Design a protein around this ligand. Structure first.
Ligand SMILES: NC(=O)c1ccc[n+]([C@@H]2O[C@H](COP(=O)([O-])OP(=O)(O)OC[C@H]3O[C@@H](n4cnc5c(N)ncnc54)[C@H](O)[C@@H]3O)[C@@H](O)[C@H]2O)c1
Ligand SMILES: NC(=O)c1ccc[n+]([C@@H]2O[C@H](COP(=O)([O-])OP(=O)(O)OC[C@H]3O[C@@H](n4cnc5c(N)ncnc54)[C@H](O)[C@@H]3O)[C@@H](O)[C@H]2O)c1
Ligand SMILES: NC(=O)c1ccc[n+]([C@@H]2O[C@H](COP(=O)([O-])OP(=O)(O)OC[C@H]3O[C@@H](n4cnc5c(N)ncnc54)[C@H](O)[C@@H]3O)[C@@H](O)[C@H]2O)c1
Ligand SMILES: NC(=O)c1ccc[n+]([C@@H]2O[C@H](COP(=O)([O-])OP(=O)(O)OC[C@H]3O[C@@H](n4cnc5c(N)ncnc54)[C@H](O)[C@@H]3O)[C@@H](O)[C@H]2O)c1
Lengths: 333, 333, 333, 333
């Protein structure tokens, strides 16, 4: 397994949690802003996901989580991380700042084998587990796991497209706050709305998902786009997809198609519920997309609104580990 | 004017604030749960809209707001409210619990002339200022001012339909919390999602707008429906309308048409902005619907997503005074 | 064990969770506002404490949780609950509405043996596990488990008093929202501040703890009082106790005394931490009181501020089960 | 007046709003992170205090607010700000990062006459209006207006000390979130509790007030200290002061003394209320400290808890204009 993590943030830390849950091996973490003793504290306590049940301590300049020793670096520059000292070969690139092939390829200076960007990439091939993993090939050295919204949207869009044909769709994500937002009104020069106080406001915003699903399901390129409203919750978001369909159908056919896929090819990626759920019901949910049967509405035989929940931190971090596992099987690693 | 208010809640008090701003005359308030000394405090201090600038005191069993004496009653059953005795003939029925014609008609027993339900009604004719006021018949004794969402959606839907034709549409409102929600998970037997802790959750809910807009614009009956997500903000909501249009157009045509209507026939009802606004920017906004030019997205020549803001408490309260003014002209009063 | 629960609210439901965790047996639940199918949903999903991991279903008009069948009643009046049909003998009185001996004794009409009020009582003897359980005697038929703040304060006050003498103290609880609070400004006639919108405000409020610790530790009667600020969090609260002490001491002596008690006589009731904890770190914490070593300040040898955390829902519900277990040992039941 | 603002943040902008209300003259603003077109948006729209009523536009490289041209600069290093060229001689240093005399003195390089740090200083003399302004020496080139908490605490502590003598006291401020807090758990290396998600948590923190009040009232040096809990509100905080008094008194004496000071020497600095107020009632409040008569508690003749509110953004911003006005009189300017 031999995973390294660059950026021990919300996703960096929860990928480490997901790796331990899945028996994957992380050997090295890099973050210039989080010293080793502070890394112990940040991994141990999580306001959203609860205290890590397990021993976490610093020992001999390494982070030790349940007996596994994780080498810690504190390099500002990715090209200076000595990944090969720790034996890290598959690097999770989770800073937010090194998303292109050019930028992510800095990790090959330290001896990394493969880099997985935990965000959309302008040029690295993008993957959503359950949707297009079979297009991965072992010569791809830098890949992307797309965004949390793309991972919720792409499963549901795949089911709708295979069964009924998406002629065109528009989506909204009602989206929890992230680390890029601000506690009170402050400077966000490249996104003025995103600078307004996160706890006070519904904030219109862009979404990664819009473009990205057109690269993940190329048949849908240019037939889907959408936007986000950031709202004052700390985690868990919901896709609200309005689609026009090519084939006439009832809402029962939509539900039966989603149910059948969640039991078979999309098992573990797409969930299905008919309960009266609210967003707190998905905190810590492992799935990429949970179809909410009761919340959706069909106006006519070809125009419908479908609602699907995702823990944007936790479900995504579990898919990073799923993607790395797939890549190492194909690579033989 | 000779307005009485039944139910001195969020809408009841802000209707009095709006009447004061618009020089309307409120002569009587009734609320069994809010004794006179408490009405002073409740009217003076408001967490969302700020302290009432001006004098509120109790004298002689009356609420005296800026010189005006308002007779206070504390009746549980509307039958027993002496409206006659205070001279209240136009009754704002803002309790939430007497919405049908037969239930609202109880105010006639104490000599009310007309009742205005401040919510959708199963059978009282619904009006939205700027959209269908000319349907108001002088012989209508119980009318409805529809919901906060219908008052936002109907202006924008009017413009789109007149210019481009709405073939079908689906709406979401991302809606602030209201008084029927719960601070922590508790019993809401008729709406199980709506009982979950309001501050913790994105909560799927129904919208009044779903029924009402096909009544207010009858040619759109059956062509439009939608749902709500309640999110943890205290006030100000946003309509997200995804429409399939009859006529090919660009997004510039949609903008130009909304700008022209806000300057002309829909002036004061529909507003227009191109600023990078967020929900807090509309707290205290007088308009029913404020079109957000920059947040909308056109996918194709006939498929588009339009975003409009509304202060669900305040814009609505001002519309209730507008409705009464219009009714009084038609009745001659 | 043979526990019945009256009021299946935040405390009613979490006492059921605590009973299952501790292997205690609940046989009957009464709530007139929550029908059986709705009880399934409310027990299964918890916005604060996460989904119940376990099977919950309605079967043959009973609630079935992990194989245990729990008879459900829906009586408005406590004297009409046929507790003996279900074999319920120890009743948790968790409505909030039947707190005196007179009111709580209604349950003896249905065949209850003992009633435990999950709130301060004006006359029923009040108990805090770890502090005064040894004053319980088997002839006491109605008892109280005091409030969540009293359960946090009393352990810490006991340690300080035994070691250093409390001459006098004043406390504040910075306290999460409860079900008595309101989503937006509405009527709370007996507590005007408590009616103001809970998510918008710091709200000064009274506390149960103030008086109650004087009944639980009678040596401290009249030497302690205090108040609450309700703040916009959904659970977890913190006591901030300013004490003048009879014996001169350093902060190290305070910490060593708290540490020694958390390892011995107060084990499981009083916790001890020296980490940089925040309130989310205590969600689901079992203890009544967790001393925060780093947050406290000693101004002089006899004047100090001590800070102690408590999950006001969860820690309290576990103490209800602890108190019932103690009572059945003393009663032989 | 000839005021320049360095750092157009929460305090920098509200200081300009306060200068406009008080007819002070701001001539220049500097912020490297906020370009002129963005300064218009940031000044016009405010989530906490509402939209600026009046004209804000950019013309010719200047910010024009109600007719006034303000020269805008975008310098990173204060040394390089041409204050001379705009005529700015009294500089509000509101960046948060140039708080020491030597760091603040950089503004003299571009011809500033005086600097006012809008935060406590390790060595610049601190002033609180109404408490120690007469200590201001004309030869003081760098002064401090202390923190929002010192400006609340010092007026109330002055009154108590003058009338009853403070023997020792311990304070807590329940403090709104600020810009140094984080929207979700993230790195705050110097304050680990302060990095945890602001909207989710009660967070123990330090207070500026702890140091500063013994400097502002030197006879209370060593007799007073305290701490903060940061809670999820956007603005408005509350001091909770527990004091041991030298002279026996009743709570009526404390009330009478606070009322007399707010009418006389501390008028406009200290306010007094007996209403059932909550934090939202003070948003936009001009005063430094508003004594809450009803929330305080006296335990004995010498031991009492006093509660005072403050709008930490707005009251403070107005005090900065007061301080500059006073300094200009003493300097003759
Ligand atoms: N938050 C979510 O729900 C979520 C989900 C999926 C994807 N993402 C994506 O993952 C990335 C990180 O997001 P996040 O939410 O974890 O943010 P975050 O701010 O919590 O984490 C970023 C981390 O990277 C560290 N860092 C910054 N510069 C570094 C550098 N030069 N070298 C190494 N480490 C550095 C920071 O200290 C921080 O700990 C982004 O691209 C984001 O869009 C976020
Ligand atoms: N809150 C909004 O944004 C909004 C906007 C538009 C319309 N409305 C509608 O207005 C109505 C009231 O809503 P609200 O937000 O003001 O709720 P609310 O709870 O604030 O007010 C309801 C008021 O009615 C009073 N009341 C209850 N029974 C009474 C009775 N028998 N007689 C007289 N008064 C009584 C209550 O004491 C309370 O003060 C609802 O139908 C709601 O759908 C609400
Ligand atoms: N919330 C906490 O942190 C906490 C902690 C300790 C103690 N308490 C106390 O426990 C009691 C309940 O508090 P809560 O937070 O669970 O409130 P809650 O509102 O969540 O629960 C009250 C429950 O009692 C039910 N009920 C009302 N009348 C009834 C009746 N006539 N018969 C039977 N059931 C009825 C309601 O439907 C509701 O489900 C109060 O006395 C409260 O002060 C609360
Ligand atoms: N927020 C409050 O309630 C409050 C009240 C009183 C005092 N203060 C103090 O005022 C100071 C600023 O606080 P704030 O709340 O306004 O924070 P903030 O983050 O809103 O504002 C800081 C501003 O300084 C700017 N800045 C950063 N570096 C700069 C530089 N090198 N030159 C010029 N400008 C630069 C930033 O762009 C930002 O706009 C702090 O010292 C704070 O403690 C805050």
């Amino acid at each position: 397994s031999k995973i390294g993590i660059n950026g021990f943030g919300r996703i960096g830390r929860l990928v480490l949690r997901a790796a331990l849950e899945m028996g994957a091996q992380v050997v090295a973490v890099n973050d210039p802003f989080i010293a080793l003793e502070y890394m112990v504290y940040m991994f141990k306590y999580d306001s959203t996901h609860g205290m890590f049940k397990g021993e976490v301590k610093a020992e001999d300049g390494a982070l030790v989580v349940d007996g596994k020793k994780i080498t810690v670096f504190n390099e500002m520059k990715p090209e200076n991380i000595p990944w090969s000292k720790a034996g890290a070969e598959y690097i999770v690139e989770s800073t937010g700042v090194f998303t292109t092939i050019e930028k992510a390829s800095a990790h090959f200076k330290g001896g990394a084998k493969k880099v997985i960007i935990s965000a959309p990439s302008a040029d690295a091939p993008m993957f959503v587990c359950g949707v297009n993993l079979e297009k991965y090939s072992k010569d791809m050295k830098v890949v992307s796991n797309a965004s949390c919204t793309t991972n919720c949207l792409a499963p549901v869009a795949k089911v709708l497209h295979e069964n009924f044909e998406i002629v065109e769709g528009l989506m909204t994500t009602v989206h929890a706050v992230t680390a890029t937002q601000k506690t009170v009104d402050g400077p966000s020069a490249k996104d003025w709305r995103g600078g307004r106080g996160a706890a006070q406001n519904i904030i219109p915003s862009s979404t990664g998902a819009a473009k990205a699903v057109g690269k993940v399901i190329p048949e849908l390129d240019g037939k889907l786009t959408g936007m986000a409203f950031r709202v004052p919750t700390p985690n868990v978001s919901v896709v609200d997809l309005t689609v026009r369909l090519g084939k006439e159908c009832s809402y029962d056919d939509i539900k039966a198609a989603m149910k059948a896929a969640s039991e078979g090819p999309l098992q573990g990626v797409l969930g299905y519920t008919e309960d009266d759920v609210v967003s707190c019901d998905f905190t810590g949910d492992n799935r990429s997309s949970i179809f909410d049967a009761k919340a959706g509405i069909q106006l006519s035989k070809t125009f419908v609104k479908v609602v699907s929940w995702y823990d944007n931190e936790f479900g995504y971090s579990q898919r990073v580990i799923d993607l790395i596992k797939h890549m190492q099987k194909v690579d033989s690693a």
